[PDB]
Amino acid sequence: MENFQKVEKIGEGTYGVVYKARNKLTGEVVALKKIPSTAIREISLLKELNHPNIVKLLDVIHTENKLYLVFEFLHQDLKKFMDASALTGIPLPLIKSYLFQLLQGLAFCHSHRVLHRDLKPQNLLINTEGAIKLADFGLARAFEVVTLWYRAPEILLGCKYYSTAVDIWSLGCIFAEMVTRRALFPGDSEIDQLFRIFRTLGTPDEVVWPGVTSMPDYKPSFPKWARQDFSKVVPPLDEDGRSLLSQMLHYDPNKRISAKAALAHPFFQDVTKPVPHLRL
Ligand SMILES: Cc1nc(C)c(-c2ccnc(Nc3cccc([N+](=O)[O-])c3)n2)s1
């Protein structure tokens, strides 16, 4: 760490505190995260998982039982950008560009059998060029109240062997939040989170999700709520956007759209790469 001069505390992530710092050797400005042999091996594998929509993991430093992760630095997270854009809304072409890029990032990681598992606006980073990138990819497999708002229903229902579909669910919740300027399912407990999902998408049953009633935390005593139309859930999103969202929010992880199939969705026929309005 003698090679890094800390600049400021930029955040407090799930796996540790994130600092902006300066590399004394290269003059590089980085994001330094201060966090078991299995963890070293898994983290080392993430250094090779390089994609333009993945925050680059520059180095892994294991010194005095402490673990530091050195990332490329981006100037803002999507949560702060969404707060800054709350009175006007993020323009739909920029929402579409960000969703398209994030789907490219997920399609890449998922093709390498790497899951994020904890996507949230707080770990989506943006730059002045119009790029958006996924941070903390693969850290959940290796290792303040942790937000449940973007948690897939199979996780809340006790599935211990969940799939890449959990990331599609989280990204669908973020897509809805960019469009409406409000969190889709802002639960403050696991049951509140599950019941918020049920109140909007309907209580799942064996018809829409075969095997759901046999899940570890499923209870036959769950209240039975009717599903709502997406026209009510995400106005003023057009029919292509609502169709894609509905496929990202299917209850059955096996029915849920893949990142690769989502990239071919008609919603992206007119996708562009606009420049965001960023104040740094
Ligand atoms: C949860 C995270 N894990 C990593 C690795 C993060 C990461 C990676 C690269 N650049 C940045 N920039 C940035 C800029 C402003 C504020 C914040 N914030 O932490 O609130 C972050 N963060 S954020």
Side-chain angles (χ1 to χ4, degrees), residues 1-159 161-280:
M1 281 305 101
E2 72 275 8
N3 302 283
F4 296 92
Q5 182 184 86
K6 281 173 195 173
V7 179
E8 59 188 64
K9 178 181 172 169
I10 57 183
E12 193 183 348
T14 314
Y15 322 94
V17 48
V18 183
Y19 304 90
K20 179 180 188 177
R22 206 167 282 109
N23 191 319
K24 293 165 181 180
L25 278 163
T26 56
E28 228 170 35
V29 156
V30 302
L32 180 66
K33 186 177 195 90
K34 186 205 270 180
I35 311 292
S37 303
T38 57
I40 306 302
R41 296 187 74 171
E42 189 49 57
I43 301 301
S44 291
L45 291 179
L46 301 171
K47 274 192 282 169
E48 296 307 287
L49 190 79
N50 297 314
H51 186 275
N53 299 106
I54 298 300
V55 173
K56 186 175 176 59
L57 177 55
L58 306 171
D59 262 298
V60 181
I61 303 163
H62 181 48
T63 47
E64 293 187 313
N65 307 314
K66 291 181 181 185
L67 188 56
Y68 308 88
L69 301 195
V70 190
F71 291 97
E72 85 171 275
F73 180 74
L74 286 93
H75 280 81
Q76 191 161 111
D77 62 49
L78 183 67
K79 196 223 172 231
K80 168 189 200 181
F81 185 63
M82 282 210 290
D83 291 340
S85 306
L87 292 183
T88 51
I90 298 169
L92 173 71
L94 184 57
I95 293 173
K96 187 179 291 192
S97 176
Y98 284 171
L99 182 63
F100 188 71
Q101 288 179 70
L102 294 168
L103 285 166
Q104 289 179 60
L106 290 183
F108 175 79
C109 292
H110 293 170
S111 75
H112 285 104
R113 302 152 297 275
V114 170
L115 293 63
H116 189 292
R117 311 168 196 256
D118 191 29
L119 284 182
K120 61 203 166 183
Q122 290 77 4
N123 54 39
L124 302 180
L125 286 304
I126 61 170
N127 66 19
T128 55
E129 313 287 8
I132 188 164
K133 302 192 192 198
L134 297 131
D136 274 11
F137 233 105
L139 303 200
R141 196 196 179 181
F143 323 107
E144 211 161 283
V145 175
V146 170
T147 188
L148 302 172
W149 300 357
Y150 310 93
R151 203 70 83 224
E154 57 269 37
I155 298 175
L156 296 162
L157 286 174
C159 183
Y161 308 94
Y162 45 82
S163 73
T164 56
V166 304
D167 293 334
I168 296 297
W169 179 276
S170 302
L171 186 54
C173 293
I174 293 165
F175 174 31
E177 187 174 343
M178 288 194 278
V179 169
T180 65
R181 304 172 229 172
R182 201 154 287 191
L184 184 55
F185 306 129
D188 64 344
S189 78
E190 289 191 49
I191 204 62
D192 185 62
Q193 187 66 35
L194 195 68
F195 288 180
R196 280 175 175 275
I197 296 165
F198 295 178
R199 283 189 278 260
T200 295
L201 301 178
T203 301
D205 55 19
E206 288 290 333
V207 174
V208 299
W209 189 349
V212 69
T213 69
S214 290
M215 297 193 69
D217 300 318
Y218 176 90
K219 308 297 178 183
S221 58
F222 288 162
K224 297 184 185 178
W225 289 285
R227 177 176 186 91
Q228 297 190 321
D229 298 314
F230 274 61
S231 64
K232 184 192 166 79
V233 181
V234 287
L237 196 57
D238 71 39
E239 197 61 60
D240 286 322
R242 298 202 313 273
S243 157
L244 172 60
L245 182 63
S246 75
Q247 297 185 92
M248 297 179 78
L249 299 183
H250 278 320
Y251 271 119
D252 189 342
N254 292 286
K255 287 176 188 62
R256 206 170 300 148
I257 194 162
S258 70
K260 232 188 185 300
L263 289 170
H265 193 281
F267 185 62
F268 296 115
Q269 199 210 71
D270 67 353
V271 69
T272 64
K273 196 194 174 174
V275 175
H277 176 73
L278 286 198
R279 263 297 95 87
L280 311 166

Tab-separated table of all heavy atoms in Angstrom, residues 47-88:
chain	number	residue	atom	x	y	z
A	47	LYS	N	-9.486	-10.880	-12.596
A	47	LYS	CA	-8.521	-9.992	-13.255
A	47	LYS	C	-8.441	-10.237	-14.775
A	47	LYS	O	-7.978	-9.359	-15.506
A	47	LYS	CB	-7.115	-10.168	-12.672
A	47	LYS	CG	-6.811	-9.329	-11.439
A	47	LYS	CD	-5.300	-9.355	-11.121
A	47	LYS	CE	-4.854	-10.631	-10.436
A	47	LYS	NZ	-3.373	-10.750	-10.387
A	48	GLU	N	-8.829	-11.444	-15.232
A	48	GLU	CA	-8.768	-11.800	-16.649
A	48	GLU	C	-10.116	-11.604	-17.360
A	48	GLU	O	-10.149	-11.635	-18.590
A	48	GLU	CB	-8.272	-13.242	-16.822
A	48	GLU	CG	-6.842	-13.443	-16.332
A	48	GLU	CD	-5.817	-12.480	-16.907
A	48	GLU	OE1	-5.464	-12.631	-18.099
A	48	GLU	OE2	-5.399	-11.550	-16.179
A	49	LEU	N	-11.198	-11.359	-16.596
A	49	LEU	CA	-12.560	-11.139	-17.085
A	49	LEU	C	-12.705	-9.662	-17.496
A	49	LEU	O	-13.305	-8.873	-16.779
A	49	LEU	CB	-13.550	-11.520	-15.947
A	49	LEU	CG	-15.030	-11.613	-16.268
A	49	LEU	CD1	-15.363	-12.921	-16.970
A	49	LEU	CD2	-15.864	-11.444	-14.998
A	50	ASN	N	-12.064	-9.279	-18.613
A	50	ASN	CA	-12.014	-7.902	-19.089
A	50	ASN	C	-13.023	-7.634	-20.194
A	50	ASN	O	-13.105	-8.354	-21.187
A	50	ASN	CB	-10.591	-7.562	-19.590
A	50	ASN	CG	-9.537	-7.644	-18.499
A	50	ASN	OD1	-9.709	-7.137	-17.384
A	50	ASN	ND2	-8.433	-8.315	-18.772
A	51	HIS	N	-13.812	-6.589	-20.000
A	51	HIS	CA	-14.813	-6.172	-20.987
A	51	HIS	C	-15.011	-4.648	-20.857
A	51	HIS	O	-14.898	-4.115	-19.742
A	51	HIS	CB	-16.137	-6.963	-20.776
A	51	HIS	CG	-17.193	-6.720	-21.821
A	51	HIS	ND1	-18.058	-5.653	-21.733
A	51	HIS	CD2	-17.453	-7.401	-22.964
A	51	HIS	CE1	-18.814	-5.710	-22.815
A	51	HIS	NE2	-18.503	-6.768	-23.577
A	52	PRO	N	-15.362	-3.946	-21.951
A	52	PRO	CA	-15.553	-2.484	-21.872
A	52	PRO	C	-16.676	-2.043	-20.923
A	52	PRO	O	-16.677	-0.888	-20.501
A	52	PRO	CB	-15.946	-2.098	-23.304
A	52	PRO	CG	-15.387	-3.167	-24.162
A	52	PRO	CD	-15.519	-4.418	-23.347
A	53	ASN	N	-17.620	-2.936	-20.613
A	53	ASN	CA	-18.719	-2.621	-19.709
A	53	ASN	C	-18.520	-3.265	-18.343
A	53	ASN	O	-19.472	-3.374	-17.579
A	53	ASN	CB	-20.064	-2.989	-20.327
A	53	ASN	CG	-20.294	-2.201	-21.586
A	53	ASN	OD1	-20.205	-2.741	-22.676
A	53	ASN	ND2	-20.434	-0.878	-21.471
A	54	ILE	N	-17.252	-3.641	-18.022
A	54	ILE	CA	-16.878	-4.187	-16.722
A	54	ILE	C	-15.766	-3.298	-16.149
A	54	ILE	O	-14.738	-3.083	-16.824
A	54	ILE	CB	-16.476	-5.687	-16.873
A	54	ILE	CG1	-17.688	-6.529	-17.397
A	54	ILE	CG2	-15.878	-6.285	-15.595
A	54	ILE	CD1	-18.938	-6.526	-16.521
A	55	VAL	N	-15.962	-2.777	-14.916
A	55	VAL	CA	-14.921	-1.932	-14.274
A	55	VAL	C	-13.652	-2.794	-14.171
A	55	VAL	O	-13.700	-3.893	-13.600
A	55	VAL	CB	-15.358	-1.363	-12.895
A	55	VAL	CG1	-14.193	-0.636	-12.200
A	55	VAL	CG2	-16.549	-0.431	-13.038
A	56	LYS	N	-12.523	-2.332	-14.779
A	56	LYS	CA	-11.333	-3.165	-14.808
A	56	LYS	C	-10.713	-3.378	-13.425
A	56	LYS	O	-10.444	-2.408	-12.721
A	56	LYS	CB	-10.271	-2.529	-15.725
A	56	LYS	CG	-9.045	-3.432	-15.931
A	56	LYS	CD	-8.108	-2.801	-16.929
A	56	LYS	CE	-6.814	-3.560	-17.153
A	56	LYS	NZ	-7.036	-4.946	-17.645
A	57	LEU	N	-10.470	-4.653	-13.068
A	57	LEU	CA	-9.756	-5.022	-11.849
A	57	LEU	C	-8.259	-4.972	-12.194
A	57	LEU	O	-7.772	-5.821	-12.948
A	57	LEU	CB	-10.218	-6.410	-11.346
A	57	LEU	CG	-9.491	-6.962	-10.099
A	57	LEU	CD1	-9.544	-5.970	-8.916
A	57	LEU	CD2	-10.080	-8.312	-9.679
A	58	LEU	N	-7.554	-3.931	-11.720
A	58	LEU	CA	-6.148	-3.723	-12.089
A	58	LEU	C	-5.219	-4.630	-11.329
A	58	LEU	O	-4.292	-5.193	-11.927
A	58	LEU	CB	-5.727	-2.251	-11.899
A	58	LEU	CG	-6.596	-1.197	-12.601
A	58	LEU	CD1	-6.217	0.205	-12.159
A	58	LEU	CD2	-6.482	-1.297	-14.098
A	59	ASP	N	-5.460	-4.793	-10.022
A	59	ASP	CA	-4.595	-5.627	-9.189
A	59	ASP	C	-5.285	-6.088	-7.938
A	59	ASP	O	-6.264	-5.490	-7.474
A	59	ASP	CB	-3.307	-4.876	-8.822
A	59	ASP	CG	-2.145	-5.238	-9.719
A	59	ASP	OD1	-1.745	-6.434	-9.722
A	59	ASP	OD2	-1.654	-4.339	-10.448
A	60	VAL	N	-4.748	-7.174	-7.384
A	60	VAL	CA	-5.201	-7.804	-6.163
A	60	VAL	C	-3.965	-7.838	-5.269
A	60	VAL	O	-2.926	-8.370	-5.668
A	60	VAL	CB	-5.821	-9.202	-6.450
A	60	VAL	CG1	-6.315	-9.867	-5.175
A	60	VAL	CG2	-6.946	-9.109	-7.480
A	61	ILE	N	-4.033	-7.158	-4.128
A	61	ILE	CA	-2.892	-7.077	-3.211
A	61	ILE	C	-3.285	-7.739	-1.878
A	61	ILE	O	-4.208	-7.278	-1.206
A	61	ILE	CB	-2.412	-5.601	-3.045
A	61	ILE	CG1	-2.037	-4.971	-4.413
A	61	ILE	CG2	-1.242	-5.505	-2.057
A	61	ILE	CD1	-1.930	-3.454	-4.454
A	62	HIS	N	-2.601	-8.849	-1.519
A	62	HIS	CA	-2.866	-9.537	-0.260
A	62	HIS	C	-1.662	-9.319	0.639
A	62	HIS	O	-0.590	-9.872	0.378
A	62	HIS	CB	-3.171	-11.034	-0.484
A	62	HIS	CG	-3.467	-11.798	0.773
A	62	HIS	ND1	-4.361	-11.319	1.721
A	62	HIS	CD2	-3.012	-13.005	1.175
A	62	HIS	CE1	-4.396	-12.233	2.677
A	62	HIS	NE2	-3.614	-13.272	2.387
A	63	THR	N	-1.815	-8.435	1.639
A	63	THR	CA	-0.760	-8.063	2.581
A	63	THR	C	-1.334	-7.974	3.994
A	63	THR	O	-2.401	-7.386	4.183
A	63	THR	CB	-0.070	-6.739	2.165
A	63	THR	OG1	-1.054	-5.750	1.842
A	63	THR	CG2	0.916	-6.909	0.998
A	64	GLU	N	-0.619	-8.577	4.979
A	64	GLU	CA	-0.925	-8.626	6.419
A	64	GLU	C	-2.386	-9.050	6.686
A	64	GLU	O	-3.113	-8.356	7.406
A	64	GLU	CB	-0.606	-7.278	7.097
A	64	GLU	CG	0.876	-6.940	7.119
A	64	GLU	CD	1.267	-5.714	7.922
A	64	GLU	OE1	0.606	-4.660	7.774
A	64	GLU	OE2	2.267	-5.796	8.671
A	65	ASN	N	-2.814	-10.186	6.074
A	65	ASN	CA	-4.162	-10.785	6.151
A	65	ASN	C	-5.235	-9.912	5.466
A	65	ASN	O	-6.345	-10.398	5.226
A	65	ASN	CB	-4.590	-11.101	7.604
A	65	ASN	CG	-3.607	-11.930	8.399
A	65	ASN	OD1	-3.079	-12.948	7.937
A	65	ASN	ND2	-3.375	-11.527	9.638
A	66	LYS	N	-4.905	-8.642	5.143
A	66	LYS	CA	-5.811	-7.706	4.475
A	66	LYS	C	-5.754	-7.888	2.957
A	66	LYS	O	-4.707	-8.217	2.391
A	66	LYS	CB	-5.495	-6.246	4.850
A	66	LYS	CG	-5.820	-5.888	6.293
A	66	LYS	CD	-5.498	-4.431	6.588
A	66	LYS	CE	-5.783	-4.068	8.024
A	66	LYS	NZ	-5.580	-2.616	8.272
A	67	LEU	N	-6.890	-7.662	2.304
A	67	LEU	CA	-7.001	-7.799	0.866
A	67	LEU	C	-7.432	-6.473	0.250
A	67	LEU	O	-8.435	-5.896	0.670
A	67	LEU	CB	-7.995	-8.933	0.515
A	67	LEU	CG	-8.088	-9.350	-0.959
A	67	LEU	CD1	-6.732	-9.751	-1.518
A	67	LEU	CD2	-9.074	-10.469	-1.141
A	68	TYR	N	-6.649	-5.978	-0.717
A	68	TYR	CA	-6.995	-4.732	-1.433
A	68	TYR	C	-7.231	-5.034	-2.870
A	68	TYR	O	-6.439	-5.744	-3.500
A	68	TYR	CB	-5.896	-3.659	-1.334
A	68	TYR	CG	-5.436	-3.367	0.071
A	68	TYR	CD1	-4.411	-4.103	0.657
A	68	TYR	CD2	-6.024	-2.352	0.821
A	68	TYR	CE1	-3.993	-3.849	1.959
A	68	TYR	CE2	-5.606	-2.084	2.125
A	68	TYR	CZ	-4.589	-2.832	2.689
A	68	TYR	OH	-4.162	-2.564	3.969
A	69	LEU	N	-8.283	-4.434	-3.420
A	69	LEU	CA	-8.606	-4.575	-4.824
A	69	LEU	C	-8.435	-3.207	-5.448
A	69	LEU	O	-8.913	-2.220	-4.889
A	69	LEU	CB	-10.030	-5.126	-5.004
A	69	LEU	CG	-10.349	-6.502	-4.361
A	69	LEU	CD1	-11.631	-7.061	-4.921
A	69	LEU	CD2	-9.240	-7.508	-4.604
A	70	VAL	N	-7.639	-3.134	-6.510
A	70	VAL	CA	-7.333	-1.884	-7.200
A	70	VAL	C	-8.129	-1.897	-8.494
A	70	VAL	O	-7.911	-2.773	-9.319
A	70	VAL	CB	-5.816	-1.681	-7.452
A	70	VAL	CG1	-5.548	-0.263	-7.950
A	70	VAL	CG2	-4.982	-1.990	-6.199
A	71	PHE	N	-9.060	-0.961	-8.650
A	71	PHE	CA	-9.914	-0.859	-9.829
A	71	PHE	C	-9.617	0.373	-10.599
A	71	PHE	O	-9.166	1.368	-10.033
A	71	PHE	CB	-11.407	-0.807	-9.431
A	71	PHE	CG	-11.916	-2.108	-8.872
A	71	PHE	CD1	-11.981	-2.314	-7.502
A	71	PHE	CD2	-12.386	-3.111	-9.717
A	71	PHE	CE1	-12.478	-3.509	-6.983
A	71	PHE	CE2	-12.886	-4.311	-9.196
A	71	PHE	CZ	-12.923	-4.502	-7.831
A	72	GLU	N	-9.959	0.355	-11.890
A	72	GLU	CA	-9.927	1.582	-12.667
A	72	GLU	C	-10.939	2.552	-12.004
A	72	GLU	O	-11.942	2.099	-11.437
A	72	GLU	CB	-10.292	1.282	-14.144
A	72	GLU	CG	-11.780	1.274	-14.385
A	72	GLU	CD	-12.253	1.206	-15.818
A	72	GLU	OE1	-12.364	2.259	-16.484
A	72	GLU	OE2	-12.623	0.093	-16.233
A	73	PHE	N	-10.687	3.862	-12.067
A	73	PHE	CA	-11.585	4.838	-11.446
A	73	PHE	C	-12.603	5.414	-12.443
A	73	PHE	O	-12.198	5.862	-13.517
A	73	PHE	CB	-10.748	6.011	-10.883
A	73	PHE	CG	-11.560	7.099	-10.219
A	73	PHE	CD1	-12.121	6.899	-8.960
A	73	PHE	CD2	-11.800	8.304	-10.867
A	73	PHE	CE1	-12.877	7.899	-8.343
A	73	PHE	CE2	-12.614	9.283	-10.276
A	73	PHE	CZ	-13.139	9.077	-9.010
A	74	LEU	N	-13.893	5.484	-12.055
A	74	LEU	CA	-14.931	6.172	-12.840
A	74	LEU	C	-15.454	7.314	-11.992
A	74	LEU	O	-15.416	7.214	-10.766
A	74	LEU	CB	-16.049	5.264	-13.342
A	74	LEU	CG	-15.626	4.375	-14.501
A	74	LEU	CD1	-15.153	3.047	-13.979
A	74	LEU	CD2	-16.753	4.194	-15.513
A	75	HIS	N	-15.928	8.406	-12.616
A	75	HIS	CA	-16.210	9.572	-11.794
A	75	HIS	C	-17.569	9.586	-11.104
A	75	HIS	O	-17.717	10.340	-10.142
A	75	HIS	CB	-15.981	10.850	-12.591
A	75	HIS	CG	-14.532	11.241	-12.696
A	75	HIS	ND1	-13.673	10.644	-13.626
A	75	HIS	CD2	-13.834	12.161	-11.986
A	75	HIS	CE1	-12.491	11.211	-13.438
A	75	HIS	NE2	-12.547	12.172	-12.499
A	76	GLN	N	-18.548	8.751	-11.518
A	76	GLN	CA	-19.833	8.814	-10.825
A	76	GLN	C	-20.520	7.469	-10.848
A	76	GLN	O	-20.290	6.704	-11.783
A	76	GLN	CB	-20.706	9.864	-11.539
A	76	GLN	CG	-21.975	10.261	-10.796
A	76	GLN	CD	-22.482	11.565	-11.312
A	76	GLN	OE1	-23.526	11.623	-11.946
A	76	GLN	NE2	-21.717	12.639	-11.118
A	77	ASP	N	-21.402	7.192	-9.853
A	77	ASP	CA	-22.210	5.982	-9.884
A	77	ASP	C	-23.627	6.326	-10.404
A	77	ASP	O	-24.008	7.495	-10.455
A	77	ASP	CB	-22.243	5.217	-8.543
A	77	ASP	CG	-22.828	5.939	-7.329
A	77	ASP	OD1	-23.928	6.498	-7.443
A	77	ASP	OD2	-22.240	5.830	-6.239
A	78	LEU	N	-24.388	5.306	-10.823
A	78	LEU	CA	-25.718	5.547	-11.399
A	78	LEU	C	-26.688	6.070	-10.344
A	78	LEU	O	-27.575	6.855	-10.686
A	78	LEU	CB	-26.258	4.268	-12.075
A	78	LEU	CG	-27.612	4.398	-12.781
A	78	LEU	CD1	-27.518	5.335	-14.030
A	78	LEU	CD2	-28.141	2.996	-13.199
A	79	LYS	N	-26.518	5.681	-9.075
A	79	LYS	CA	-27.399	6.187	-8.012
A	79	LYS	C	-27.300	7.713	-7.925
A	79	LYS	O	-28.333	8.394	-7.948
A	79	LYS	CB	-27.068	5.528	-6.657
A	79	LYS	CG	-28.186	5.729	-5.638
A	79	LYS	CD	-27.653	6.080	-4.273
A	79	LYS	CE	-28.773	6.464	-3.338
A	79	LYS	NZ	-28.497	7.767	-2.674
A	80	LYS	N	-26.092	8.238	-7.885
A	80	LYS	CA	-25.896	9.682	-7.817
A	80	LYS	C	-26.429	10.370	-9.078
A	80	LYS	O	-27.042	11.367	-8.938
A	80	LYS	CB	-24.433	10.024	-7.552
A	80	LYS	CG	-24.077	11.491	-7.737
A	80	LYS	CD	-22.572	11.655	-7.668
A	80	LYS	CE	-22.091	13.036	-7.363
A	80	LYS	NZ	-20.585	12.976	-7.376
A	81	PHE	N	-26.240	9.791	-10.244
A	81	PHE	CA	-26.730	10.320	-11.523
A	81	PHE	C	-28.260	10.317	-11.536
A	81	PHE	O	-28.866	11.288	-12.001
A	81	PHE	CB	-26.154	9.529	-12.717
A	81	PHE	CG	-26.517	10.085	-14.074
A	81	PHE	CD1	-26.105	11.357	-14.458
A	81	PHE	CD2	-27.267	9.338	-14.973
A	81	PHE	CE1	-26.458	11.878	-15.707
A	81	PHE	CE2	-27.614	9.859	-16.221
A	81	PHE	CZ	-27.213	11.130	-16.580
A	82	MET	N	-28.880	9.235	-11.010
A	82	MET	CA	-30.341	9.166	-10.958
A	82	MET	C	-30.892	10.225	-10.018
A	82	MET	O	-31.907	10.847	-10.337
A	82	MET	CB	-30.785	7.793	-10.533
A	82	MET	CG	-30.706	6.801	-11.660
A	82	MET	SD	-31.966	5.575	-11.394
A	82	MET	CE	-31.287	4.744	-9.966
A	83	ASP	N	-30.205	10.480	-8.886
A	83	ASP	CA	-30.619	11.525	-7.943
A	83	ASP	C	-30.498	12.895	-8.602
A	83	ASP	O	-31.445	13.679	-8.531
A	83	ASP	CB	-29.794	11.454	-6.638
A	83	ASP	CG	-30.072	10.238	-5.763
A	83	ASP	OD1	-31.149	9.608	-5.931
A	83	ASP	OD2	-29.211	9.907	-4.917
A	84	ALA	N	-29.364	13.167	-9.281
A	84	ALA	CA	-29.086	14.424	-10.006
A	84	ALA	C	-30.091	14.682	-11.153
A	84	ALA	O	-30.361	15.832	-11.481
A	84	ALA	CB	-27.676	14.384	-10.581
A	85	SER	N	-30.630	13.612	-11.756
A	85	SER	CA	-31.568	13.671	-12.884
A	85	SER	C	-33.032	13.505	-12.452
A	85	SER	O	-33.891	13.357	-13.319
A	85	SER	CB	-31.235	12.563	-13.883
A	85	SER	OG	-29.891	12.564	-14.333
A	86	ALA	N	-33.322	13.496	-11.139
A	86	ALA	CA	-34.664	13.194	-10.620
A	86	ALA	C	-35.764	14.192	-11.018
A	86	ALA	O	-36.899	13.769	-11.198
A	86	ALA	CB	-34.626	13.078	-9.109
A	87	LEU	N	-35.453	15.482	-11.150
A	87	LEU	CA	-36.505	16.451	-11.462
A	87	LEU	C	-36.927	16.408	-12.935
A	87	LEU	O	-38.090	16.677	-13.255
A	87	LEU	CB	-36.061	17.872	-11.069
A	87	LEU	CG	-35.913	18.154	-9.557
A	87	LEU	CD1	-35.532	19.601	-9.308
A	87	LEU	CD2	-37.208	17.847	-8.784
A	88	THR	N	-36.003	15.997	-13.811
A	88	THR	CA	-36.192	15.986	-15.258
A	88	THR	C	-36.329	14.579	-15.839
A	88	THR	O	-36.992	14.406	-16.858
A	88	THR	CB	-34.968	16.685	-15.904
A	88	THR	OG1	-33.763	16.093	-15.374
A	88	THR	CG2	-34.953	18.201	-15.652
